[PDB]
């Protein structure tokens, strides 16, 4: 139960990366943080009520492998996980990607579930928060995946004309399809430290201009300077901060730290 750190090596006791939310205490480097866990570390205590759980995929194209590549290593339906709940006594919907699930690839379920969060947060008339981590759209579902962008973004539109605050939290990594959809349409775009965010992966991007990619290129710190991000909040602070901001946008009283 003694894990090693991605970029640092500093051995660490698992129980430690707990009150430190899957974060390196010696390098501050944020690491893989489960979709269901995140939602917990955000929403208050007990309040967690899962939404869109009655949603499961299916191969409608008979792709290569597909049905088999599509649940034992995540015990989850699809890359996204919506969850109703509260933040400091504030009613608020949430949703997060499981980058372990094929790459947090967006496709059918991911889009549907997301929409749910919006539908839920719409009638309840409360804020929506989404933690994003993906590598693109689920090719296995082709144009179905693509359309998700237009949909999730179309819904987010209702959310907005209603006056309800939606905060997108871009986490390392958030690329392609999601990056270029609801993951960037937040009222407040917040990126976790040193995250990798962009539309095209550095890979393809690179073998294009056939040269060296600028320093930092696509990292929270790079983006924030190109004005694509409102601010960069660290994970532990995230909980309260989100409540803090949201609280102001909602005119509600500031949370009790």
């Amino acid at each position: 139960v003694w894990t090693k750190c991605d970029s640092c090596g500093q051995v660490l006791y698992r129980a430690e990366l707990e009150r430190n939310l899957e974060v390196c205490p010696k390098c501050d480097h944020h690491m893989r943080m489960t979709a269901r866990n995140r939602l917990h570390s955000l929403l208050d205590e007990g309040s967690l009520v899962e939404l869109g759980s009655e949603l499961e995929p299916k191969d409608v194209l008979k792709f290569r492998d597909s049905k088999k590549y599509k649940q034992k290593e995540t015990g989850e339906k699809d890359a996204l996980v919506v969850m109703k709940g509260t933040l400091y006594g504030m009613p608020v919907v949430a949703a997060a990607f499981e980058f372990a699930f094929m790459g947090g690839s967006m496709g059918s379920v991911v889009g549907a579930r997301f929409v749910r969060a919006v539908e839920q947060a719409l009638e309840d008339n409360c804020p929506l928060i989404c933690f994003s981590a993906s590598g693109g759209a689920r090719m296995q579902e082709a144009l179905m995946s693509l359309m998700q962008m237009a949909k999730t973004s179309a819904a987010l539109a209702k959310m907005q004309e209603r006056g309800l605050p939606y905060i997108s939290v871009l986490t390392d990594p958030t690329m392609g399809g999601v990056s270029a959809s609801f993951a960037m349409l937040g009222d407040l775009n917040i990126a976790e430290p040193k995250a990798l965010i962009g539309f095209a992966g550095p890979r393809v991007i690179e073998q294009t201009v056939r040269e060296k990619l600028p320093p930092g290129f696509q990292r929270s710190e790079f983006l924030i300077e190109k004005g694509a991000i409102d601010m960069i909040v660290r994970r532990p602070e995230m909980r309260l901060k989100l409540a803090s901001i949201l609280a102001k946008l909602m005119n509600l009283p500031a949370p009790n730290p």
Partner: protein, 301 residues
């Protein structure tokens, strides 16, 4: 010029050089060019879509619309040449036309990034859809792009946000929006102007969440095995229609749209007129609701 497997049709073109009445052996030309196309494989189709002689945005603009004034710029950075847009009439009715402009020759292709736009192009594209709405005007877009230009400035300039902001704003558009994939429907860079009420797709055009070559070299560790991906994903016209994905499939001339752009214009110009009219029986309120509804349905959940 002439594509690959169109060879025998190209060779048969040796008629102009030519009893004297035999000049109508081209009846066989009409066949062949008929049987050759009858059994085309998925991958073979995408090649016609990418065909070097295929009509681009401006071609239809000149073939089916009149009084076309092309508007430029996004008001903040530049005038993307990979995006053509402007106000014209469609049988008197003014319309806002927006589309990917590739370019016949290797020089124009360069001047217009082979129709791959930079974030500043979608920002222009939207500014125009917005001007349309402002003046209770219809919006007609022509999709044909390898995808959104992947680059440094593109990213540094918000290629993501640019695209996203369009998917959002387009759905809320308060006028009719007919979208036609006249060529290569590439990724969300094509989707950035494809959120319409009616979404037709020409007979040989394609559409995908990623190019075949890529998808190929990602889930087959092989570039050349792209054709395999093409048939896997379902990038072809019908393959899609069989899934409520596209509204209608506009047909091309015998052996491809390149074989006769004046007829293709006819077919298309017609189809637009159809949709762009069985849509005016709708109230703005209904229109948008219809759209939002059609939008949530995409997929199987």
């Amino acid at each position: 010029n002439f594509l690959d497997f169109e060879q025998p049709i190209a060779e048969l073109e040796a008629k102009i050089d030519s009893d004297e009445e035999v000049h109508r052996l081209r009846e066989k030309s009409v066949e062949l060019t008929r049987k050759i196309f009858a059994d085309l494989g998925a991958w073979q189709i995408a090649q016609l879509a990418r065909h070097p002689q295929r009509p681009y945005t401006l071609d239809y603009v000149r073939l089916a619309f009149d009084e076309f004034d092309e508007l430029a710029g996004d008001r903040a950075y530049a005038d993307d040449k990979a995006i053509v847009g402007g106000i014209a009439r469609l049988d008197g009715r003014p319309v806002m036309i927006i589309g990917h402009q590739k370019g016949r020759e290797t020089k124009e292709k360069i001047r217009r990034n082979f129709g791959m736009p930079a974030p500043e192009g979608y920002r222009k594209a939207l500014r125009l859809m917005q001007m349309a709405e402002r003046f209770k005007m219809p919006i007609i877009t022509f999709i044909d792009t390898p995808g959104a230009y992947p680059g440094v400035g593109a990213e540094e300039r918000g290629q993501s946000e640019a695209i996203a902001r369009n998917l959002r704003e387009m759905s809320r558009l308060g006028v009719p929006v007919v979208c036609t994939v006249i060529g290569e429907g590439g990724s969300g860079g094509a989707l950035a102007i494809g959120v319409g009420d009616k979404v037709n797709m020409l007979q040989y055009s394609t559409y995908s969440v990623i190019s075949p070559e890529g998808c190929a070299s990602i889930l087959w560790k092989s570039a050349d095995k792209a054709p395999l991906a093409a048939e896997a994903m379902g990038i072809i016209r019908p393959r899609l229609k069989e899934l409520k994905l596209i509204d209608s499939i506009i047909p091309e001339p015998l052996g491809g749209a390149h074989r006769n752009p004046e007829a293709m214009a006819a077919s298309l110009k017609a189809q637009l007129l159809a949709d762009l009219a069985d849509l005016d029986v709708l109230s703005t309120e209904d229109l948008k609701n219809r759209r939002y509804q059609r939008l949530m349905s995409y997929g199987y959940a």
